[PDB]
């Protein structure tokens, strides 16, 4: 199965080797280090995992633990904008296409957005998406509720239109537990195992598989 957790510097060599880049390998490594050592609470990865029950591939952090996705995140640190409100930037959202249809991109983004609001009191996040892919559009506008402000024309290096998107960040709305159902939740107080010993006949019936011989 797939695990979601915070990125650490121990993830960056695998991030580097997970994709071909146009920049040189040492530039990328320094770039990854700059992110993870500047905003060490903002970035997240998705990996496979094995649980307790030889051409070493460069994307394994550990046996049975392969990097399959990540979201690399930063706060605004342009000197030319030192008087603007704290905002967040998604430097990179990257999920292996083979690991599609498992909600990975959404889960990474949701952790990123919450961390941005909670750790850095970021007020908004801004971003652009190629007019080409509706999957990214659907992810940001629909699933994640980004506002589509406008369409910046010929925005990309190769001349493609971009959607300009922005999301105002509000801690109460970004709370992860808002998105667990498509709605019971843990009250963080009651006993979880309370059910097992209830004596009502309907309890005895439904909780059948918990009574041993």
């Amino acid at each position: 199965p797939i695990n979601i957790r915070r990125a650490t510097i121990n993830d960056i060599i695998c991030m580097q080797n997970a994709n071909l880049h146009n920049l040189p390998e040492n530039y990328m490594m320094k770039y990854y280090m700059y992110h993870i050592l500047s905003w060490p609470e903002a970035s997240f990865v998705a990996t496979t995992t094995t649980l307790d029950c030889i051409k070493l591939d460069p994307t394994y952090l550990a046996p049975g633990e392969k990097l399959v996705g990540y979201v690399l995140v930063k706060m605004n640190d342009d000197p030319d904008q030192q008087n603007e409100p704290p905002n967040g930037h998604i430097t990179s959202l990257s999920v292996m296409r083979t690991y599609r249809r498992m909600g990975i991109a959404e889960n990474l983004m949701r952790q990123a957005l919450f961390a941005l609001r909670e750790v850095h009191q970021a007020e908004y996040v801004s971003l652009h998406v190629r007019q080409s892919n509706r999957a990214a559009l659907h992810l940001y506008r629909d699933t994640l509720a980004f506002e589509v402000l406008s369409i910046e024309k010929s925005y990309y290096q190769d001349g493609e239109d971009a959607y300009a998107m922005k999301k105002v960040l509000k801690l109460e709305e970004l709370q992860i537990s808002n998105f667990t159902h498509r709605k019971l939740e843990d009250d963080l107080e009651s006993d979880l195992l309370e059910d097992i010993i209830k004596q009502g006949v309907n309890d005895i019936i439904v909780e059948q598989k918990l009574i041993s011989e």
Binding site: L20, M29, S38, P58, V119, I176, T180, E189, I196
Partner: protein
């Protein structure tokens, strides 16, 4: 005195990054030649502008003309800078300190020193420089953070905690909004240090807890703080308390497996299948879309009918949605509970396939066939693996996943060119998919088709380290093949044929062997640069206020030469060096292939750095054995043999095989180790080879072939 003025203008110019204009003034002072520091500055100027060969000459010159060892503070400083640019960090340290020893008043030299000393691992002296800088500049928080960090790195945990407490006092009222983050990090960092120091002491741990509770309002890393809090409760034996925190962590990220397993431990149910079943049924209600509540039970259920139902509920909905990774998601179960889970999933998925119409349910259809192909490939049933992937391809030939899997099958069958060719069909589906481009490059390299690999990768026309190591291994295989063609190639009218051919294959052998060594050697160069990439962060992390991340980076730095790619390059490259050592009795790397010191070459470029960093419980003892064996240090060979047995027992065939090679001075690998030491230990040799072949029977075709060609050459 007119010269000193010119020099000083030059110095200013250099500092203003105006190198060519600075050089003009120097060329003039030198045209009039004895001038030590105009020599040094010219050196630094030439370096700044690309003239590296000349820069070195001028620098070396200035340094010869410095017999007294007493140069001017400015000259010393200039040399310090030059040495740092060329990455002679120890040299840079000597010059920078000489600058101060000769009366420099630039306090910034201490900051430059602290960086360099931290970089070479001299944290005792780095701490001295941090103290000296800090006392000159008590008003900058970054200097307090670096001093505390330097203290912690030297083991002075109480001192580090005390330094952080001091700054807290200074800042007690003057924490701007611009400063809340750094403050947050320094509070958590202090908690870290107090936490380590507390060890298992209950009273100390209780203080770490109250501190953590006091800082919480000012700490923005809630994840870090909750994890710390739970761990403290555990160490205090306050399990119910820890379980609340873990449930709090799960609620913040219900997709992180780790918190669920810690929750089990905190409830005392890690060994109770019934209670865990209850816990996960409960969590499943809170987190119905998340993996852990659904997957963890697949890991422990023993009742067949119960396990089968939960497996069905986990797998079938994924097949229905057409999830490519369905099999990957359950693979750990096939790995860890094979006998139990495998026949259950086989029936579940065959039954599901039975009820699908390819026309009305095409997505479930093809993805179910895809799952089954992986299922049977994993169990080594190749005809079935082929049939199920074929059913998917025949139905929908435009999905690249089907080609990846078809290629993997053929790769297991040992048909490397074919495997590459199939992936290359997948690639043609979308030439803009970089990920498929890269797997294709790799497959062609595995087939030793370097031209095609380079060509495919040149669509995005810089060397990646993974590419370079795959290319090295290809060259090595090509080397072995050319050598074998040369050995098998060993009247007068065709005795002109074999004559030129030998001469051709002698060339290629040297070409490939040299190219393999050159490619492998590039890997330690990458990793040394990763190490060097820490340089900026000794200061920068202090300025940014991320001391905890900085300490994680230092741990990463101390593990670089134990990383998977580095270790892979080191183990493969050893084949060559060890050989060259035995047999002993630059665009193509000929200079590397004709070394007089293969073993000192290996140790210097690969083995020493790995040896310094590797943990004893991760050491390759066979490598140590083989290495010291050729170094004449048989004492270490015994140590290696012993420490090997003390981990794997002495039943291992490799264990027996190894002991003998030292004494003289069925199980496949054991028989093999003996073989590559047949010229030193008296074996059947020919009866050993026949043994090694009889053992090959069970393994998959690829493993058979690889051994027959490149291990029993």
């Amino acid at each position: 005195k007119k010269e000193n003025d010119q020099f000083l203008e030059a110095l200013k110019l250099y500092e203003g990054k105006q190198y060519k204009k600075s050089l003009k003034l120097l060329d003039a002072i030198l045209k009039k030649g004895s001038h030590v520091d105009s020599l040094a500055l010219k050196g630094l100027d030439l370096y700044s502008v690309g003239e590296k060969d000349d820069a070195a000459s001028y620098v070396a010159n200035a340094i010869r003309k410095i017999e007294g060892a007493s140069a001017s503070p400015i000259c010393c400083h200039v040399l310090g800078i030059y040495m740092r640019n060329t990455k002679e960090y120890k040299e840079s340290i000597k010059w920078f300190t000489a600058a101060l020893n000769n009366g420099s008043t630039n306090k910034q030299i201490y900051r430059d020193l602290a960086t360099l000393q931290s970089q070479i691992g001299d944290f005792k002296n780095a701490l001295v420089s941090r103290k000296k800088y800090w006392e000159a500049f008590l008003g900058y928080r970054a200097n307090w953070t670096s001093l505390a960090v330097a203290q912690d790195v030297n083991g002075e945990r109480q001192q580090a905690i005390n330094t952080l407490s001091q700054f807290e006092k200074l800042a007690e009222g003057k924490i701007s909004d611009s400063e809340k983050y750094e403050h947050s990090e320094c509070l958590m960092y202090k908690n870290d240090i107090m936490y380590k120091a507390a060890s298992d002491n209950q009273d100390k741990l209780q203080n770490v807890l109250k501190h953590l509770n006091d800082i919480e309002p000012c700490v923005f890393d809630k994840f870090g703080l909750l994890e710390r809090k739970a761990t403290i409760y555990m160490k205090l034996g306050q399990l119910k308390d820890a379980s609340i925190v873990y449930r709090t962590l799960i609620k913040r990220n219900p997709d992180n497996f780790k918190y669920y397993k810690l929750l089990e431990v905190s409830l005392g149910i890690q060994g109770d299948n019934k209670l865990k079943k209850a816990l996960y049924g409960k969590l499943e209600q809170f987190y119905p879309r998340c993996e852990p509540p659904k997957f963890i039970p697949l890991t422990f259920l023993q009742d067949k009918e119960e396990l089968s139902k939960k497996l069905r509920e986990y797998v079938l909905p994924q097949l229905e949605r057409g999830v490519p990774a369905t099999f990957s998601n359950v693979k750990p179960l096939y790995q860890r509970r094979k006998s139990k889970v495998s026949p259950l999933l086989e029936k579940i998925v065959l039954d599901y396939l039975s009820g699908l119409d390819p026309t009305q349910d095409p997505i479930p259809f093809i993805w179910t066939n895809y799952y089954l192909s992986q299922h049977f490939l994993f169990l080594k049933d190749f005809p079935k693996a082929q049939e199920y992937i074929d059913a998917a391809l025949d139905h929908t030939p435009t999905l690249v996943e089907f080609y990846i899997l078809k290629a993997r099958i053929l790769k297991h069958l040992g048909l490397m060119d074919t495997a590459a060719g199939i992936l290359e069909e997948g690639r043609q589906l979308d030439l803009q998919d970089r990920f498929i481009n890269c797997k294709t490059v790799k497959y062609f390299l595995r087939a030793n088709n370097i031209d095609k690999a380079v060509e495919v990768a040149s669509l995005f026309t810089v060397e990646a380290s993974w590419f370079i190591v795959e290319q090295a291994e290809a060259y090595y295989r090509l080397y072995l093949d050319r050598k074998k063609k040369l050995d098998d190639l060993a009247e007068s009218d065709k005795s002109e044929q074999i004559a030129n051919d030998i001469k051709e294959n002698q060339w290629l052998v040297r070409k490939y062997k040299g190219l393999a060594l050159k490619r492998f050697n590039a890997i330690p160069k990458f990793y040394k640069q990763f190490e060097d990439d820490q340089l900026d962060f000794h200061s920068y992390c202090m300025r940014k206020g991320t001391p905890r991340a900085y300490l994680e980076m230092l741990e990463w730095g101390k593990a670089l030469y134990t990383k998977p790619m580095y270790v892979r390059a080191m183990k493969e490259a050893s084949k060559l060096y060890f050989q060259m050592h035995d047999d002993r009795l630059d665009v193509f790397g000929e200079k590397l292939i004709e070394t007089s010191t293969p073993m000192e070459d290996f140790a210097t470029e690969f083995y020493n750095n790995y040896s310094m960093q590797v943990r004893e419980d991760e050491r390759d003892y066979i490598l140590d054995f083989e290495f010291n064996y050729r170094i004449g240090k048989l004492a270490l060979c015994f140590a290696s043999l012993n420490k090997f047995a003390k981990r794997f027992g002495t039943t291992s065939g490799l264990f027996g095989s190894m002991a003998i090679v030292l004494l003289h001075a069925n199980d496949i690998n054991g028989l093999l180790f003996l073989y590559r030491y047949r010229d030193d230990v008296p074996i059947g040799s020919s009866n050993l080879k026949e043994m090694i072949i009889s053992s090959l029977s069970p393994l998959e075709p690829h493993s058979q072939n690889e051994i027959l060609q490149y291990y029993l050459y």
